[PDB]
Amino acid sequence: DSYTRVPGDGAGGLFEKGNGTDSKPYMIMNATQIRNMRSVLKSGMKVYFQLGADIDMAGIDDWQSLNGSGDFPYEIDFDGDSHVIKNFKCSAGDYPSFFGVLCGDCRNVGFVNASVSSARQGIGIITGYLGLKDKGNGNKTGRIVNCYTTGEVIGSGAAGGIAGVLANSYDGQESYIKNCYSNATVSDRAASGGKAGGIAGRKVGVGGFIENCYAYGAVSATKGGVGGILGQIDKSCDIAIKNSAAWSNLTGVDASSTVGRIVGVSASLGSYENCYACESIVLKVNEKTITASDESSATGTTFHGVAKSAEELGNIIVAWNPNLWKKGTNGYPIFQWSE
Numbered sequence: 001d002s003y004t005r006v007p008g009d010g011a012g013g014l015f016e017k018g019n020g021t022d023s024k025p026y027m028i029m030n031a032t033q034i035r036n037m038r039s040v041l042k043s044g045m046k047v048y049f050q051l052g053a054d055i056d057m058a059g060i061d062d063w064q065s066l067n068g069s070g071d072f073p074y075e076i077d078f079d080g081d082s083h084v085i086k087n088f089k090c091s092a093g094d095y096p097s098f099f100g101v102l103c104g105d106c107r108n109v110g111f112v113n114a115s116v117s118s119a120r121q122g123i124g125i126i127t128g129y130l131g132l133k134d135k136g137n138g139n140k141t142g143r144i145v146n147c148y149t150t151g152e153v154i155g156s157g158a159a160g161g162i163a164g165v166l167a168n169s170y171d172g173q174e175s176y177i178k179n180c181y182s183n184a185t186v187s188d189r190a191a192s193g194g195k196a197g198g199i200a201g202r203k204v205g206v207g208g209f210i211e212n213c214y215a216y217g218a219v220s221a222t223k224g225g226v227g228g229i230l231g232q233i234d235k236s237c238d239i240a241i242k243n244s245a246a247w248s249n250l251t252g253v254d255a256s257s258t259v260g261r262i263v264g265v266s267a268s269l270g271s272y273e274n275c276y277a278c279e280s281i282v283l284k285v286n287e288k289t290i291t292a293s294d295e296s297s298a299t300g301t302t303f304h305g306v307a308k309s310a311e312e313l314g315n316i317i318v319a320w321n322p323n324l325w326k327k328g329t330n331g332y333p334i335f336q337w338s339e
Contacts, residue, residue, distance in 0.1 A: 003039060006032040011040050016052060025050040025079065031057045034085070038066055046075035046104055046139065051083040054339070058086070064093030068100020068128055075139055076102065080109025080147070082337040088125070088151075091117040095128030097164070102127040102142040112339050114151035114184065122158025122165055122201050125149040125184060131167030131175030133205040138173030145176075146324060148338065150183045150217075158201030158231065159188040161215050166230075166239070168205025175208040179324055181334070184217040186248075188231065194224025194257070195231035195265065198248045203233045209240040212320040214313075216247040216332055223254035225264030227302075228277060232265035239270045243320055245313055246277040246305065247332070255286040260302030267303035272296060275305035278313055 007013025014036040015026040025048035028034050034055050041047055057063075067074040076099060088111055090096040096118050099106065106126060114125045121128060126149060131142035149161050158164040161182025167175045177199060188194035188201060195202040198215025210229060225232045228246020233239055246261045258264050261277035275296070283290040292304040308316065310331050317333040318325045328334045 002036060004032045004035045006036065014039060020047040022048055027052045028055065029053050031055055031060055035060065035062070041066065041074040043073040046077055048077040050079045051081050051109065054083045054086065056086040057088045060089070063090045065090065065095045065097050065100025065128065067103065068093060068095035068097070072101040072103065072132060076104045078106040078109065080107065082108050084110040084112050084339045086112045088114040095121055095123055097123050097125060097128045099127040101129040101132065102144070103132060103140045105143050105145070106147060107145045109147050110338060111149040111151065114149055117154040118156055120156050122195065123153060123155040124160040124163040124201065125151065125153055126162050128164045129167060130163040130165065130177065133167045134170060136171065138171030141169060141173040141175040142167065143174070143176050144180060145178045146180070148181045148335065152185045154187050154189060155201065156188065156190045157193060158195040159186045160197045160200040161186050161217055163200045165202045165204055166200045166208055166210070169207030177210045177213055179212045179321060181213060182215045182217055186217055186219045188221040188224060190222060190224060192223045194221030196221040196224065197227045197229055197231040198246060199229050201231045203230060203239045204237055206238050209242065210244060211242045212244065214245040214247055214317055218251070219248045220251040220253065221257060223257060224252070226250045226252050226257065226259045227264035228261045228281070230263045233263065233267065233269040235266060237269060241270060241275055242273040244275050245317060246281060247313065249282045252285045257285050258301050259283050259285055259290060261292050261304040263298065263303040265301060267298035268300055270298060270303065272298065272303060275303070276308045276313060276316060277305045279307040279309055
């Protein structure tokens with residue numbers, strides 16, 4: 001029985017149609033239906049969802065993340081089908097975000113004017129964790145592909161425009177973020193050990209990557225690491241970041257902060273290719289402007305990539321996938337289907 005006002009196919013009318021399988025995904029046409037997702041999750045198998053329209057979540061106060069609690073038992077396949085979810089808000093429950101912990105796939109969705117906040121946990125708009133670390137079952141990895149976010153993220157211990165924490169790769173599957181952008185303001189307000197990134201706050205485990213991503217929302221931490229793409233790589237962990245660009249202003253408030261155009265902390269643990277930053281971004285630590293030097297690998301804490309002009313970056317980003325990306329009228333690339 002539904003907890004919402006909507007309402008047999010579509011789980012008896014909770015959705016427009018479908019049964020949560022690959023061939024019959026639960027089809028979501030409005031925000032009341034999107035609020036029924038939690039009711040049809042299954043601890044024993046991945047459940048499939050698809051958007052059939054843009055979804056405006058204005059006036060929705062009762063979201064808690066789909067898979068942020070317990071042992072994170074719910075695997076999810078989500079296809080936005082090139083639609084947007086507007087005015088999504090979450091500031092309560094475990095891992096405030098859309099998914100909480102994403103085990104499975106999210107593709108082809110934009111979040112417009114989202115607002116997610118936590119005083120206690122590391123978060124992003126789409127998910128808190130993308131994948132789980134070092135599980136025995138590859139179905140616990142997670143991928144976000146062809147997605148974007150705008151709005152605001154406030155976390156504590158990690159903050160990313162897309163995900164709080166990216167996990168790793170094992171058992172024949174990989175965790176990654178690919179062909180995504182964000183314009184969200186991203187802030188890690190932890191008193192110490194902040195991990196703020198334009199795309200992801202933190203990376204855990206060995207294996208996993210970020211590819212064909214850029215960000216342009218302001219990224220900051222009260223006291224910690226700030227990166228245009230990634231805040232922190234954990235000790236004894238790694239990442240690859242390839243064909244990506246930083247286009248955000250980056251601010252570490254405390255003097256002990258580290259700011260990297262691409263990666264903010266333990267950047268030498270990563271492997272990089274074709275990483276760029278707009279020449280006009282402003283980097284600050286303790287209110288003092290910092291210069292960054294061009295580099296294509298990291299030898300120390302931060303990784304800055306190579307500076308490019310706005311015009312150059314527009315060329316570069318669209319070339320990542322000309323069927324997906326387009327130049328925006330204000331210089332910032334977006335998707336062909338972006339609102």
